[PDB]
Amino acid sequence: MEGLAGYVYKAASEGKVLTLAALLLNRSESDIRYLLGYVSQQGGQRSTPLIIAARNGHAKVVRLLLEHYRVQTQQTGTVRFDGYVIDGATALWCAAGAGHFEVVKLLVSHGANVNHTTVTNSTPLRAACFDGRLDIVKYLVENNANISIANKYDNTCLMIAAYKGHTDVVRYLLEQRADPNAKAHCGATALHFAAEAGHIDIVKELIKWRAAIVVNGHGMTPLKVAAESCKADVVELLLSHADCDRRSRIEALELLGASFANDRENYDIIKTYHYLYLAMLERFQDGILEKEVLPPIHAYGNRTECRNPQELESIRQDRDALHMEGLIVRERILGYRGAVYAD
């Protein structure tokens, strides 16, 4: 008997809607209740026929189970997504997470809970924002998918959207009045993620929707995140708006200029001088934001940090001294948990 449950699950996961109907036909009431609810283990993952079919985009198989055999949508399982298992996903979650828009409408039509939460509090809406299917995100939002339900670490749909670069959905969520200043467990806003990734269009959309400049738990404003992550264009766009007059905007320009000497990604020294020196000029524009220079670290030689514009002009060449300056500036100025997956 449980052997037949294996055939019924295979058919559903293979999409073979005819051969599933032959298996379910001429069965009893306790029987179709049994065969369609049998949680079968395809490894470590565990799922029901309706979940695996919705997971694999087999709309015909799902239309049959919903319409003619009264399968319950609230069924949860633990399904595999990008390697790792996801605990407590319903069929609607798996479909929204897999970008099967045709399946998603089917389930929502038949009363599937739009706001079901994974054990890590991942709504199907979040699954759709992670994928980026704007058409699924609109449908769920239109069908009362609450945009406010964050994951276990208070990471919202807007953040996973901003981080993953889905500019089209980031605008939709903002247009549906998603709070642009929600903070995550670590203290990050949607702007922090969009900045660290260098999502220039998304940083523009957040600012247009009044995204404030908030400090993170490690102490970072979004400005300092773009600088540290070497996102020069993102820095310029943030520096192009209302900001802490000179103290924070200068600290940005040095951290950014430090970043062009502290990683192989850019490792462009001409940019280091350009930004370190633009910072140095900015300080000596009044009469003055003097540098609270640190004692010479035993590692970098003596090499005290430049505090005069003339002092830094003597280093427009001698790359080695500039690379050292980039470590000193970063060390002086400085010395994302759970916001990356569908969870």
Which method, experimentally, gave rise to this model? X-ray
For residues 196 and 188, give the distance between their C-alpha atoms in angstroms, rounded to a whole number.
11
Torsion region of 174: left, alpha or beta (phi above 0 gives left; psi -120 to 50 gives alpha): alpha
Do residues 101 and 69 touch, judged by C-beta distance below 8 A? no
How, if at all, do strands 40-41 and 46-47 pair? antiparallel
Nearest Cα neighbor of 250 from 282, 208, 297, 217 is 282
How far apart (Å, rounded) are the C-alpha atoms in residues 341 and 343? 5
C-alpha–C-alpha distance, residues 76 and 269, integer Å: 54
Would you give the distance in Å from CA 249 to the centre of its chain? 26
Round to whole Å and give the CA distance between 297 and 63: 68
* Encoded amino acid at 1, one letter: M
Closest by Cα among 215, 205, 102 to 161: 205
Q: What sign does the CA torsion over 141, 146, 150, 155 have?
A: positive
Residue 121 CA: distances (Å) to CA of 86, 126, 275: 11, 9, 43
Question: Can you count the helices (H) and strands (E) in the chain?
Answer: 19, 4
Query: Which amino acid type is present at position 9?
Result: Y
Dist. CA 204–CA 167, nearest whole Å:
10
Q: What is the DSSP letter of 293?
A: P
Give the tokens for residue 69: 């055999």
CATH class of the 1-112 domain in this structure:
mainly alpha
Going from the C-alpha of 70 to that of each of 34, 38, 106, 148, the distances in angstroms are 12, 15, 13, 31
Question: Given the DSSP bridges, would you call strands 84-90 and 46-47 parallel, antiparallel or unpaired?
Answer: unpaired
Largest CA distance in the chain: 92
Chain position carrying tokens 């427009």: 316
**Structure tokens that stand for 164 in this block:** 């993953």
Please state the φ and ψ torsions of residue 165, each to the nearest 5 degrees: 80, 20
User: Cβ(191)–Cβ(162) under 8 Å?
Assistant: yes
Q: How many CB atoms lie within 10 A of CB 329?
A: 26
Question: Which residue, 128, 73, 122, 79, is CA-closest to 101?
Answer: 128
Tokens of 81: 């997504």
- Please list every residue in the chain followed by a chain break, i.e. its C lies more than 2.5 Å from the next written N: 287, 335
Q: Is 185 annotated as a binding residue?
A: yes
Question: Residue 86: which H helix or E strand, with range?
Answer: strand 84-90
Within its chain, how far is the Cα of 36 from the centroid?
35
Is 157 known as a binding-site position?
Answer: no
Give the pair of three-digit tokens for residue 10.
């295979």
Buried b (16+ CB within 10 A) or exposed e, 220-240: bbbbbbbbbbbbbebbebbbe
Q: Resolution of this PDB entry, in A?
A: 3.3
User: Closest by alpha carbon to 165, among 340, 26, 343?
Assistant: 340
Three-class SS string for the chain? CHHHHHHHHHHHHHCCHHHHHHHHCCCCHHHHHHHHHCCEECCCCEECHHHHHHHCCCHHHHHHHHHHCCCCCCCEEEEEECCEEEEEEEHHHHHHHHCCHHHHHHHHHCCCCCCCCCCCCCCHHHHHHHHCCHHHHHHHHHCCCCCCCCCCCCCCHHHHHHHHCCHHHHHHHHHCCCCCCCCCCCCCCHHHHHHHHCCHHHHHHHHHCCCCCCCCCCCCCHHHHHHHCCCHHHHHHHHCCCCCCCHHHHHHHHHHHHHCCCCCCCCCHHHHHHHHHHHHHHHCCCCCCCCCCCCCCCCCCCCCCCCCHHHHHCCCCCHHHHHHHHHHHHHHHCCCCCCCCCC
- Residues 179, 285: Cα–Cα separation, whole Å: 38
Tally of CB atoms within 10 A around 33? 15
Does residue 54 contact residue 100 with C-beta atoms inside 8 Å?
yes
Contact call for residues 250 and 272 (beta carbons, < 8 A) = no
Q: What does the angle CA 120 – CA 121 – CA 126 come to, to the nearest 5 degrees?
A: 110
Write out 205-233 in H/E/C secondary structure: HHHHCCCCCCCCCCCCCHHHHHHHCCCHH
Q: Which residue type is seen at 27? A: R
Q: What are the domain boundaries of the chain?
A: 1-112, 256-333
* 94 labeled part of a ligand binding site: no
| Per-residue CA distances from 143 to 95, 112, 332 (Å) | 15, 11, 51
Looking at the DSSP bridge assignments, the partners of residue 76 are 90
Report how far residue 200's alpha carbon sits from residue 242's, in angstroms, rounded to the nearest whole number: 18
